[PDB]
Design a protein around this ligand. Sequence first.
Ligand SMILES: O=C(O)CNC(=O)C(=O)O
Ligand SMILES: [Mg+2]
Ligand code: NI
Ligand SMILES: [Zn+2]
Length: 331
Amino acid sequence: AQNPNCNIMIFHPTKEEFNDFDKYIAYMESQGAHRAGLAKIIPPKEWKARETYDNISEILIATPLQQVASGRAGVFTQYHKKKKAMTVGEYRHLANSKKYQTPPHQNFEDLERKYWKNRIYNSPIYGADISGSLFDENTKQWNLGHLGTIQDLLEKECGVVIEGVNTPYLYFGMWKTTFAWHTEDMDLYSINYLHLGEPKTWYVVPPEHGQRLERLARELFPGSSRGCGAFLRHKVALISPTVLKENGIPFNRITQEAGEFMVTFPYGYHAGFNHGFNCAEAINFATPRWIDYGKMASQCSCGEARVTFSMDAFVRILQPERYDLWKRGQD
Ligand SMILES: O=C(O)CNC(=O)C(=O)O
Ligand SMILES: [Mg+2]
Ligand code: NI
Ligand SMILES: [Zn+2]
């Protein structure tokens, strides 16, 4: 069995190996990368996502989200307070303001300490989930707007044609902006490219150990757990590395820098935070190995998780028993 300790693997594909995306995901898995739940891919030196980032300031963040925390430093939830629209140029200025900028620090480890110590006492503003792409249409390799669609994958594997589309999302972050512990919708893969700016630190639980995280989370958020049997789908709960270590939950951490891809694998729980102003792009995708995860994915039917149009068909085809209850939670 490859990668039995479930370490995060880092890959350095050549330009020739960067041509066929599906093939390279399958290669990574042949080496055990999926056991970690997350892998880093450093593109070949010849590659670029686009020529420059000099002309992105007029992109609109229609609903910036202020991330307000409640709880204790290592175990907290966050809710998202909607703010007035602002452009990327306005947002970058805000990120770099004295109120929101990254503090002085020695290294990534120092900054991580400061994050876990102080995150709850501030409410950073995140431009998340903005439909769009920053890949140049002429970038042919690992262009997140040109991947094979999940609907076509389900059709190729299972023979059923379904409605729905699959497009990428932009994330504009600042210091302390936070992504709560989650797996992807329907336990899909995700891929995330850090286009520009300051790093993003990730934490991940090996898929084979996801239920240990879930058990801890039920203990640590006992009201939430009573309200919904899949409340991590709400994407609001944070648990620090110190707390996970105290409770024996297996996990790993890595920092992504600008120009690097991260891939999350089915049922790989992940969480993290941004170091300062940045812009990432991410999209879900599927492979044949995903299908069995899709069939077994938990679902939130309490009404909180509310998700895209395209998840309908996945639930309907892969989880017909669950469909009626899940759809009620959609409506
Ligand atoms: O970058 C973020 O805020 C969150 N991204 C992801 O959870 C992902 O790419 O799967
Ligand atoms: Mg612009
Ligand atoms: Ni994710
Ligand atoms: Zn729920």
